[PDB]
């Protein structure tokens, strides 16, 4: 399949080099897989959802999505423009707040939640977990995480936006887990993006178009832009077969697009996120 006119980072996604704006990927498109969005909530009426997406937890007054954060991510993940497994479902857990907050208690318990959940929900093709958020290191936050990878489910983090070594913050440095950082549409690193030995992984991050609350659209930036392309390809993968929850974060490095990537320190992976699919 192709979607024309695709925001960039689906296009990248697809593609061996930098600079164009078709999406190619399966029709199968993560039919049957799940994905949690575990953030501030997802907007499951705005029309790019299509129906697949709905709130399954939260921790607060709503499960509304009262920011925006949180319904951009699960954009990127599986809405029909600019998701990257268009028809994923969608499981929104809000444990953050409208301000875009959360204790890690309450996000601790999100992932556990998760863990278990996914027993009562219908996701032949595998489960995948989405955590756009972070912050200092916490071992019990990367317990948690390694956790909830390894109940079965893939696990993608963001590296987060320190220009830092993400070793310094949580669930960033869980080993065990998918870390995320963010590049650009030349292929450069994202200015804010973190960096270091624990990132598996590049996604697209700066300047990502995507689905917003009030049944809107906007383009932001962050390493939580680049951590739902990889969950989607995750999700996306796991569909067609070719990996599994536990393997996945492997097999993405494997077939990833290898040394592209300009202002990557050394000693951080040179590896951008690729479907390779040969239309």
Same mark, same amino acid.
């Given at each position: ?12 996604? #697809? ?85 875009? #907050? ?113 049944? #809107? ?29 536990? #393997? ?32």
């Amino acid at each position: 399949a192709a979607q024309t006119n695709a925001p960039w980072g689906l296009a990248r996604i #697809s593609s061996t080099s930098p600079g164009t704006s078709t999406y190619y990927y399966d029709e199968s498109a993560g039919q049957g897989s799940c994905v949690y969005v575990i953030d501030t909530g997802i907007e499951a009426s705005h029309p790019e959802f299509e129906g697949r997406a709905q709130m399954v937890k939260t921790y607060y007054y709503s499960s509304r999505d009262g920011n925006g954060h949180g319904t951009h991510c699960a954009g990127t993940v599986g809405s029909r423009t600019y998701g990257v497994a268009k028809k994923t479902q969608l499981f929104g857990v809000k444990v953050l707040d409208d301000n875009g #907050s959360g204790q890690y208690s309450t996000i601790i318990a999100g992932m556990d939640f998760v863990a278990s959940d996914k027993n009562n929900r219908n996701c032949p093709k595998g489960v995948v977990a989405s955590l756009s958020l972070g912050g200092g290191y916490s071992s019990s936050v990367n317990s948690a995480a390694a956790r909830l990878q390894s109940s079965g489910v893939m696990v993608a983090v963001a590296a987060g936006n320190n220009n830092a070594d993400a070793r310094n913050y949580s669930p960033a440095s869980e080993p065990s887990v998918c870390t995320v950082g963010a590049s650009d549409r030349y292929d450069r690193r994202s200015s804010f993006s973190n960096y270091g030995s624990v990132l598996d992984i590049f996604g697209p991050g700066t300047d990502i178009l995507s689905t917003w609350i009030g049944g #809107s659209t906007r383009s932001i930036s962050g390493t939580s832009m680049a951590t739902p392309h990889v969950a989607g390809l995750a999700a996306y993968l796991m569909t067609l077969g070719k990996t599994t929850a536990a #393997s996945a974060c492997r097999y993405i490095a494997d077939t990833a697009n290898k040394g592209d990537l300009s202002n990557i320190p050394f000693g951080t992976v040179n590896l951008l996120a690729y479907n390779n699919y040969q239309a």
